Design a protein around this ligand. Sequence first.
Ligand SMILES: Nc1nc(O)c2c(n1)NC[C@@H]1CN(c3ccc(C(=O)N[C@@H](CCC(=O)O)C(=O)O)cc3)C(=O)N21
Ligand SMILES: Nc1nc(O)c2c(n1)NC[C@@H]1CN(c3ccc(C(=O)N[C@@H](CCC(=O)O)C(=O)O)cc3)C(=O)N21
Ligand SMILES: [Cl-]
Lengths: 282, 282
Amino acid sequence: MALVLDGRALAKQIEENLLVRVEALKAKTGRTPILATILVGDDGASATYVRMKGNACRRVGMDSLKIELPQETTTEQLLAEIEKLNANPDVHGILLQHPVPAQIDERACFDAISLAKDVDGVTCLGFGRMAMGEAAYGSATPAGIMTILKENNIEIAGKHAVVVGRSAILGKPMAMMLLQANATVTICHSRTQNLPELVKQADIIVGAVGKAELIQKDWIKQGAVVVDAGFHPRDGGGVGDIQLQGIEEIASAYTPVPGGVGPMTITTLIRQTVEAAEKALG
Amino acid sequence: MALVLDGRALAKQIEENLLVRVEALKAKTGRTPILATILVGDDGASATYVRMKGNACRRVGMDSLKIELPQETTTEQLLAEIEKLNANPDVHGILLQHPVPAQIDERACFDAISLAKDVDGVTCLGFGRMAMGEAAYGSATPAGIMTILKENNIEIAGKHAVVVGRSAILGKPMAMMLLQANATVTICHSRTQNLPELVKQADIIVGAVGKAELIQKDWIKQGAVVVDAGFHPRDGGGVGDIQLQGIEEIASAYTPVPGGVGPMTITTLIRQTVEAAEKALG
Ligand SMILES: Nc1nc(O)c2c(n1)NC[C@@H]1CN(c3ccc(C(=O)N[C@@H](CCC(=O)O)C(=O)O)cc3)C(=O)N21
Ligand SMILES: Nc1nc(O)c2c(n1)NC[C@@H]1CN(c3ccc(C(=O)N[C@@H](CCC(=O)O)C(=O)O)cc3)C(=O)N21
Ligand SMILES: [Cl-]
């Protein structure tokens, strides 16, 4: 049977280390690390993930500054809020939960976040630096995925990694991170032809399409490493972007859904915020 | 049978209106657009390419500011020179010819160039912005290749593009630009295990390895679009990264070497300099 890539376990483990680090920092400086979380509008999943990220902050001994803005917020209004957080020395990281209301230029607002506080890794600057091997906080989910792979001793160098999806915060950074780790990388999307064949060639497959079980189990190469970055709620167990039923007979290793990529998304954000606080308060 | 993708003819065509634009800007403002070229050390090819770029500037009514620094220039020294040029209002674009001497952190120096003057498209910020679809000067060679494909009506959307090579100024930006044009993109490099297999599936193949005729003609798909971004001088006619002798029997369209990608590398830099000058002066 396939190795279960246990992101839930790894997240908890990482948080135990973060906790002692945060407590040491507070004891030395008297100051608490702070993630500013920006939630714009009433999207349910967005509310949930910000809630979970706030919880993660408190588990490791830090806190969050919760910024809640109405659905009708303008790009200019959100930019003003982000600049207030940039200029606040008490705020160490800034999260803008995506997707913001569609009238807002989300890209412009991402890029307004100062690099030093880009702990979710959403800036063009941060992306470009990461792609070219320079120090920068990585996009939360992709960086979480790399950590899962690394800490489970998964071979990446020389493997053919197929990333299905090319989103700004997930697919694109994932591809560039795998490339930096010396995988041959294929990037697919909605205009990709022969997707089943490309997926079948993959030694490592990353489902990042935001559509329930789009990647079919019979497309998966026998022995492949299967990363499912999706989540779609359902009665009696939610599912991701990949058909994972019976995956244990097919993959060499796989991330379960729930409890795989998800927990490591949140914990990666918090770890990078601790790093930012450690730097800022050191 | 193949369509020759004539970069030399396209470069000449494009310069016609660039000259009109520059002469209009000069007549209107009384100021001459300047590209600052930085040549560090004794690389013969670098010197040759810098002169070609200086010549190209002058062909369209602009001028160059020739910065020549010694072989043993340090990172600190180069950075200081770039900051002088950033703060020079008479300089509208900055080129740092690669590869600088080994002791210099080239990435750090590329990134010191102000985005507004990054007309060669070498900054991490420029790369990330391009990758995320924000307006930015693109890396000269890749952007030139996209122009060649567009001007020759080459279908990109939905094609399987394979880019062999992943360098900062060529392979990586090439990959993202093709991705932006809705190709499915596979990025190969020195740790790719079955390079011939992958090249054989390429609808569009980009040779960006810097090794004479490494990409074999036997690997090319019948009807492929073939882009050779290499140049290696030989007695009575240099060769690129791809075996092109007899390529006309196999490719639907191909870039000759010489006279393909090269001319459009220079034209792209000059065009983006014209753009920078117009923005700065107009
Ligand atoms: N800026 C920004 N950064 C992010 O990193 C995110 C963002 N926007 N918007 C959506 C994605 C998705 N996402 C996220 C985070 C955690 C989980 C997670 O842990 N999910 C559980 C199942 C419960 C559920 O998803 O509601 C899991 O075990 O996978 C899922 C998505 C998240 O946090 N994302
Ligand atoms: N920063 C930076 N930007 C660039 O855009 C370049 C750089 N460094 N260093 C090397 C590459 C390669 N390069 C370049 C430019 C023009 C030509 C060219 O036009 N070559 C002729 C043949 C003559 C020859 O190559 O000596 C051709 O028709 O291809 C070849 C490489 C160039 O300008 N490059
Ligand atoms: Cl001339």
